[model samples]
Target: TTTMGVMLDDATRERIKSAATRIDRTPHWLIKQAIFSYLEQLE
Candidate 1:
């Protein structure tokens, strides 16, 4: 198994928090959702 890292400024995290609340998921889940979503497109 492997792990990776991500970075974001406070402004970006603010958006994540807002969106996450509406979606009933935390920022971490939203980030993982996007990460795998992009990975699927790449391969």
Candidate 2:
């Protein structure tokens, strides 16, 4: 798996956290999902 890094201010982090809480998932999964989704779109 390719590793990636991102930076976010507290506001963005809070938004991600809220989405994760709503979905009952972790932020890491959400980030991975987005990365794979974007790769698939490129492919």
Candidate 3:
């Protein structure tokens, strides 16, 4: 497994945070989404 960290200022962080909250998913959840999306495309 790999780890990633992004540094964002207030505005960007707020936007991303709001989007994440509105979408009702966390970053970990997004990782799962991305994994499945990739697998579906490959399969």
Candidate 4:
């Protein structure tokens, strides 16, 4: 696991927060999982 900061537009940030709530996950977890899945597609 790693830690970093990112700058997201307000709408994008809100979307992540809402989606995370609906899915019962933290925004960080969802974002991290998304990045991991995206990396897999590159290989």
TM-score of each: 0.78, 0.75, 0.48, 0.82
Off by over 4 Å in 1: 1-5
Query: Which sequence of candidate numbers ranks them by lDDT, best first?
Result: 4, 1, 2, 3
lDDT of 3 by residue, 1-43 (tens): 8887756689876665676778997755665676799999996
The global C-alpha lDDT for each of the candidates, from Candidate 1 onward, is: 0.92, 0.88, 0.72, 0.93
Give candidate 3's whole-model lDDT: 0.72
Which candidate number would show the highest TM-score if scored against the true structure?
Answer: 4
Candidate 3: which stretches are off by over 4 Å?
Answer: 27-43
Better of 1 and 3 by TM-score: 1
Each prediction's RMSD to truth: 1.7, 1.8, 3.9, 1.4
Candidate 2 local distance difference test against the native:
0.88
Model 2, 1-43: lDDT tens digits are 7866899899999988889889999988887888899999996
lDDT of 1 at 41: 100
